[PDB]
Amino acid sequence: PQVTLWQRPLVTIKIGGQLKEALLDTGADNTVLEEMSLPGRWKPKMIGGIGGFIKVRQYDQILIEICGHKAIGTVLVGPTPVNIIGRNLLTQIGMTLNFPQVTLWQRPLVTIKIGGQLKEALLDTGADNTVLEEMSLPGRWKPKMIGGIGGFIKVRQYDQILIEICGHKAIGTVLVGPTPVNIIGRNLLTQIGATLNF
Ligand SMILES: CC(C)(C)NC(=O)[C@@H]1C[C@@H]2CCCC[C@@H]2CN1C[C@@H](O)[C@H](Cc1ccccc1)NC(=O)[C@H](CC(N)=O)NC(=O)c1ccc2ccccc2n1
């Protein structure tokens, strides 16, 4: 299957005998599922996202079927609003990002040029929006709040901003605020023809 990014890239998963929907998330290092019944031992862990941290239960060597593809890996369970399939499992199902083809054994980082400045950013199929660290941008902005796995942050919203993503030009909305990682979300991924392939 090839997947464009005009909509959230959702898949059906089977785990612990149960069926769920989950987000294919190139921006996530880990796989994090809403609270659910799994069998066996687990270790406590803390994981960060936009908004802060959540406590999760870590289950190792869990079998999961992702759209009919089997993988064994670590699954985290806790207070996430969305089930997310992260790179630890995406690699096991041959997932690639294409716009250059990009495997997911490492974070899919790209160089961007925005506001006359060069930065590195994460290609993030799990993000609806594009969120950049604090930086100087010109023009009017609007206040907004956006949510992530740890809660919410306040950002400045800039509309109709020109960004160059690995040489490919897009114009769209960019949010600026206290994110720890520059994130290219689906609003801009679609403009550079990014697709998920597995
Ligand atoms: C960026 C924004 C527009 C706000 N969108 C989102 O945040 C949506 C929100 C959704 C609902 C809540 C549950 C997660 C999904 C997926 N996310 C996108 C999703 O891609 C998100 C993007 C991201 C990457 C890095 C740092 C922060 C945020 N990744 C994550 O939340 C995963 C969670 C995990 N595997 O532990 N975070 C990381 O993989 C990760 C990597 C490095 C880090 C360094 C320092 C601090 C935190 C770090 N977190």
Please give the CATH number for the structural domain made up of 1-99. 2.40.70.10
Is residue 47 in contact with ligand 1, taking CB distance under 6 Å?
Answer: yes
CATH 2.40.70.10 domain range(s) in the chain:
1-99, 100-198
Neighbouring-strand partners of residue 117: 114
Mutate to test the pocket of ligand 1, among 149, 175, 176, 196 (most ligand atoms within 8 A of CB): 149
For 37-63, give the DSSP string: ---S--EEEEEEETTEEEEEEEEEEEE
Q: Is residue 91 classed as helix, strand or coil in its secondary structure?
A: helix
Please give the CATH number for the structural domain made up of 100-198. 2.40.70.10
Is residue 185 in contact with ligand 1, taking CB distance under 6 Å?
Answer: yes
Cα–Cα nearest to 126, from 22, 24, 194, 12: 24
Neighbouring-strand partners of residue 53: 48
Resolution value (Å, 1 decimal): 1.9
Is residue 82 in contact with ligand 1, taking CB distance under 6 Å?
Answer: yes
Report yes or no: 9 and 27 within 8 Å, Cβ to Cβ: no
Alpha helical stretches, state H, the chain = 87-90, 186-189
What is the enclosing helix (H) or strand (E) of 174?
strand 168-176
User: Does 124 participate in catalysis according to the annotation?
Assistant: yes
Q: Is residue 3 classed as helix, strand or coil in its secondary structure?
A: strand
Is residue 86 in contact with ligand 1, taking CB distance under 6 Å?
Answer: yes
Q: What is the dihedral of CA 111, 114, 119, 123, to 10 degrees?
A: -50
Task: Answer positive or negative: Cα dihedral of 44, 29, 191, 135.
Answer: positive
- Technique used: X-ray
